[PDB]
Amino acid sequence: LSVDTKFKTEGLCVDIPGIPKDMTYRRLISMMGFYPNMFITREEAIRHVRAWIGFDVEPLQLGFSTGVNLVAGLPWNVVRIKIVQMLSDTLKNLSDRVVFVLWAHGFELTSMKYFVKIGPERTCCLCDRRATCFSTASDTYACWHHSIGFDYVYNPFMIDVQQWGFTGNLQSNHDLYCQVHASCDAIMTRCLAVHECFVYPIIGDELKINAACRKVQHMVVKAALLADKFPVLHDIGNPKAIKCVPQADVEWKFYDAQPCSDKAYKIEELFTDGVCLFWNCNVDRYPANSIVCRFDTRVLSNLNLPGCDGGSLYVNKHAFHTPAFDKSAFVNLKQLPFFYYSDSPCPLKSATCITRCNLGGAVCRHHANEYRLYLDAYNMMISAGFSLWVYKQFDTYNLWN
Ligand SMILES: O=C(NCc1nc(C2CC2)cs1)c1n[nH]c2ncccc12
Ligand SMILES: [Zn+2]
Ligand SMILES: [Zn+2]
Ligand SMILES: [Zn+2]
Numbered sequence: 033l034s035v036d037t038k039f040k041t042e043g044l045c046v047d048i049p050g051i052p053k054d055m056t057y058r059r060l061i062s063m064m065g066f067y068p069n070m071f072i073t074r075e076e077a078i079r080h081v082r083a084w085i086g087f088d089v090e091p092l093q094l095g096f097s098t099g100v101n102l103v104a105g106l107p108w109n110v111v112r113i114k115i116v117q118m119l120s121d122t123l124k125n126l127s128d129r130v131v132f133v134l135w136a137h138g139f140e141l142t143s144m145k146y147f148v149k150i151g152p153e154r155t156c157c158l159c160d161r162r163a164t165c166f167s168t169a170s171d172t173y174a175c176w177h178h179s180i181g182f183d184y185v186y187n188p189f190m191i192d193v194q195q196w197g198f199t200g201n202l203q204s205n206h207d208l209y210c211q212v213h214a215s216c217d218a219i220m221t222r223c224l225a226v227h228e229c230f231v232y233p234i235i236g237d238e239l240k241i242n243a244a245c246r247k248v249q250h251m252v253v254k255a256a257l258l259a260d261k262f263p264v265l266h267d268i269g270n271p272k273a274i275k276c277v278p279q280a281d282v283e284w285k286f287y288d289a290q291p292c293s294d295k296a297y298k299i300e301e302l303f304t305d306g307v308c309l310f311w312n313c314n315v316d317r318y319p320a321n322s323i324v325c326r327f328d329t330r331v332l333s334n335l336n337l338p339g340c341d342g343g344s345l346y347v348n349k350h351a352f353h354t355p356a357f358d359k360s361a362f363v364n365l366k367q368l369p370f371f372y373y374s375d376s377p378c379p380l381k382s383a384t385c386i387t388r389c390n391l392g393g394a395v396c397r398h399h400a401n402e403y404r405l406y407l408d409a410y411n412m413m414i415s416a417g418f419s420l421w422v423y424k425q426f427d428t429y430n431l432w433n
Contacts, residue, residue, distance in 0.1 A: 033073045035061070043194045047138025065145035067153050067187050072131065077191045078229050082337065082347060083127035085119065086218030086225075087190075089140040095214025097133070097222040097338075098122055104146070109183070112147035116165050116182050124176035125334045126235065128162050132190040135202045135221045149184045163187070193225050210341040212356075227340040230353040231293050236334050238348050241416045244409030249276045249311055249325065251406065252420065255373045255386075256307060256323055257282055259430035264306035269313030282306070289313055293343075293353040296361070307423070314355055320364040324421040329357045331417030368420035370410055371428045372403045380404070386431045 035058040041051050052059075057071050064070075077084070086097030094102045094111070100118055104111045119130055134140055154163035156175040163173035165182040174182055198205050206213065206220040209227045213219050254277040257265070265282050267275075269289040289302060296314040308322040318324050329336070329344035337345040342356030373386045380400035382390070387403075389396040395403070 033057070033069045033071055033076070035069050039192075040195055043136055043192075044138040044141075048142075060141070064141050066148075066150050070150065070188070070190055072189050072191055074191070074196070074229065076189075077131055077133075077225075078351075079232075080127060080129060080131055080189070081226070081229070081345065081351060082232070082235070083123065083129045083131040083189070084133045084222055084225065085122065085130055086220075086222030087132040087134055087140055088214045088217035088221060089143050090214045090217070092139060092143060093214040094143070095216065095218045097215070097218040099215050099219070101215045104143070108146045112185075113181075113183050115147050116179055116185060119185065120165065120176040120179045123164075128175070129164060130185065130188045132188055133218075133222045133225050134190060134192045135194055135217065135224075136192040144188075147185055148188055150187050153187065191225075193221060193228075196228065212342045223338075223340050226337075226345055226353070230345055230351055231340050231343075232347050232349060232351065237412070237416070238335065240409075240412055241335075241348065244412045244416075245325070245418065246276075247406065247409050248413055248420070251373060252368060252422070253277050253309060253323060254280060255371070255428070255431060256422065256426060258373075259427065260307070260425070262306040266303055266306065266308045268302065268308060268310050270311065276311075291352055292355065294355065296355045296358070315361065316358075317361050317363065318365055318421070321423050322365060322421070323368075323423070324362065324365060325418055326357070326361070326421070327354050328417045328419050329354055333417060336417060362421045364424075365421040366424050366426075368422040368426070369428070370407075371431075372406050373428070373431055374399055374402060376402075384428070386428060391432055 036056050039055045039057055039060050041053060041055045045051050057069055061070055088095045092104045094104060098118060102111050102114060123130055149166050154173045156163050156178055157172040158178040159175060161175035163186055164176050165174045165179035166184040166186040167182040173186060202217060202220055206224045210223055213223055257280045262282055265284050266287060268287045270286055273286050275284050292314055296316045299315045299317055308319050310318060310322060310324045312325055312327060314326060327346060335348050339345045339353055343354050346352045346354050371384045371386055378389045378396040378398060380395040380403060385395050385403045387399045389399055
């Protein structure tokens with residue numbers, strides 16, 4: 033983002049009366065009292081969504097989308113220490129930076145000089161990550177992991193949503209899309225920005241989660257077909273359009289539905305023969321003859337960011353805004369019970385290890401190993417926030433035969 037790009041300044045003229053209408057980023061940064069630009073493009077912001085922290089200023093009340101309000105009542109030299117600590121603990125497992133997301137009216141921008149320092153890009157003094165903080169006590173730099181005791185934010189980034197072309201004030205623009213939400217403005221601001229852009233690097237267990245989801249899907253569907261012998265399966269929303277049980281006898285019919293990022297699909301808009309499979313295809317109410325995996329937006333993980341109108345921004349390779357978890361959607365189904373099924377050729381005791389060996393009295397070692405690995409993946413999937421539901425007649429007792 034060129035520092036010579038124009039900044040629309042009408043939103044600032046109540047806190048800064050008389051501000052020129054003609055204004056570049058270069059001149060605004062100078063006026064803020066200060067890595068080509070502190071400000072970034074929408075595109076760049078989107079690529080670093082994990083780094084977003086709503087920030088509003090209203091003595092001055094500083095509010096962040098973490099829900100914290102600070103009053104700068106204590107002097108700036110202690111307030112800045114709290115800011116560094118809060119951002120480090122919020123972001124250290126999400127991002128190599130911070131992006132302050134503003135609805136800029138002026139005070140938030142003139143207050144930056146009291147807790148921000150800028151300079152060349154640097155590296156942490158204790159590791160190889162880019163530096164995000166600076167300490168005036170030791171004249172050293174640190175990343176979010178090693179910033180304990182550091183008093184200044186270093187080379188933050190920032191983006192003013194009001195530059196995107198909105199009519200009306202923040203609240204009225206936010207409330208058009210979200211009924212769930214200084215800190216309250218910081219939250220609305222980030223929320224509105226997530227809605228505009230969404231309604232990525234490996235930072236955690238992405239790869240184990242995705243392999244576990246693939247394994248569970250194959251297990252549960254294969255077993256549903258064996259136990260109930262459905263003649264046809266309606267696979268709704270498959271992004272890959274690959275059969276998850278390619279050797280099953282059934283007639284596999286695919287129906288295309290992109291991941292709904294706003295409201296859940298209405299089943300009437302989007303089948304009574306056989307079984308319906310919804311693997312992360314979010315509808316308002318699932319038919320009774322369904323196998324379903326639905327992500328619980330309420331779960332706490334480094335992969336799951338707070339979203340708009342109760343949904344969450346699930347970032348796992350790609351960004352997937354997901355509508356709010358609603359228990360009533362599953363009213364025609366029951367929770368899927370854990371089980372492990374295998375027909376592969378053959379000390380574990382388990383009533384839910386459904387294999388020939390266990391049927392005959394004693395689980396062989398191979399199926400003991402595979403059961404324990406499968407349990408591990410299953411638990412990884414549940415902990416990651418996924419929930420599984422199945423048609424009410426599903427009964428693993430039917431697998432023994
Ligand atoms: O489900 C998988 N990964 C977790 C994800 N969850 C989301 C959104 C919040 C719903 C996007 S990705 C997966 N990864 N490979 C697979 N193969 C077969 C079936 C599922 C998977
Ligand atoms: Zn470090
Ligand atoms: Zn909101
Ligand atoms: Zn066995």
